[PDB]
Amino acid sequence: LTPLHVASFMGHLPIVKNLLQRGASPNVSNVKVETPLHMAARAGHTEVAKYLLQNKAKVNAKAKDDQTPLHCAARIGHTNMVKLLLENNANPNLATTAGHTPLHIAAREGHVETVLALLEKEASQACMTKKGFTPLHVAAKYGKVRVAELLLERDAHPNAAGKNGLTPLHVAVHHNNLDIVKLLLPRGGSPHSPAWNGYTPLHIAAKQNQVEVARSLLQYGGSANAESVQGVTPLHLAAQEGHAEMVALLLSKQANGNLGNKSGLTPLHLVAQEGHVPVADVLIKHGVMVDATTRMGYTPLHVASHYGNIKLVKFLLQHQADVNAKTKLGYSPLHQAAQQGHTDIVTLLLKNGASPNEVSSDGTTPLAIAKRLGYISVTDVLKVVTDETSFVLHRMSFPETVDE
Ligand SMILES: [Br-]
Ligand SMILES: [Cl-]
Ligand SMILES: [Cl-]
Ligand SMILES: [Cl-]
Ligand SMILES: [Cl-]
Ligand SMILES: [Cl-]
Ligand SMILES: [Cl-]
Ligand SMILES: [Cl-]
Ligand SMILES: [Cl-]
Ligand SMILES: [Cl-]
What we know:
This is Ankyrin-1. By secondary structure, the chain is mainly alpha-helical. The protein has one domain (about 1-404): Serine Threonine Protein Phosphatase 5, Tetratricopeptide repeat. The chain is about 50% helix and about 0% strand. It is built from 24 helices and no strands. Helix 4 (about 45-55) packs parallel to helix 6 (about 80-90), helix 5 (about 70-75) runs antiparallel to helix 6 and helix 11 packs parallel to helix 13. The longest helix is centred in the first third of the chain and has 10 residues, at about 45-55. The chain starts with a helix and ends in a 19-residue tail after the last helix. The structure holds bromide ion and chloride ion (CL) (9 copies). One chloride ion (CL) binds near residues 78 and 79. One chloride ion binds near residues 59 and 61.
């Protein structure tokens, strides 16, 4: 650090004048370190910069990170240090090693005036980060509403996106910012924009149980049957996270209760997995298929039995599920309850008529499994009712699931 760097940053107009008169120059080393002008900008020391600029200070001089003096002026939210850097000749579209322009920065802090000042002067709003963002995206993330307006009132791209496909509307919903959403749609933010996984804004709101946002999205046309690459709908997500009120809203908007994903999973199936009786109610009342099957042949009972929640297993049974529903490989809701050692379900399944003498495509009978896993409490209950091993003899059984 030269005496002039310390001078500028400290705001010592006296000295800075002196050093510059006595032959000192604004931009010393021909490398890329922060200059006395950058130092000037940050501290907001205007006169000091109104000087260095007089002399020959470079305004587009780049620092380590490639950030320019103008980039600092911005971060601070010092409109005048900006109206000045600009007034002279700072290029507003110079990016940082990450792709940030003074504009994104201003955007993040929510420095309305600074942004306006930046727009007035060719500051491009198409400028993208390497994360795939634009000033509007940033606006939406840190929920800066009037930056969003101003930005839109002046040709922002309602739904420009990087390589991930995340549109401003996508971000906005993600960081629950109704203010921005209700603001984007009219200006054209599309409710259909697919992300890198095919997720449409409604998928998000649906998952994070945001009825408010969901309503809007639907209102403007968004489909509740839009498919992720997995073939997963917003209904799936909403059901899987047990968000009942939403699962109701969606259904009441042509959401297809029986539509399954890439492998065959129907919302009810996922509901059986996490076991949320309420949603399970909403769907069956609506008229979903109770014993809808996967590609392999698992029913929501198979699934509800396999995993924990026995409560849901009652519900499915009460609502007439087929308790001897077999898989393409002979596995029944009992084999699962056994294989996972859920005694109480092996009690309930049997009680509700489940057959215990069913040999699978392997050779296993629910007792055979309970035994091999050393789950004893279960082996006891099956021991009695299970029949004779008219033969003697390790492949298991898992219901299909959604990925990552
Ligand atoms: Br609306
Ligand atoms: Cl320059
Ligand atoms: Cl200001
Ligand atoms: Cl993300
Ligand atoms: Cl994001
Ligand atoms: Cl995420
Ligand atoms: Cl928020
Ligand atoms: Cl099927
Ligand atoms: Cl389990
Ligand atoms: Cl469960």
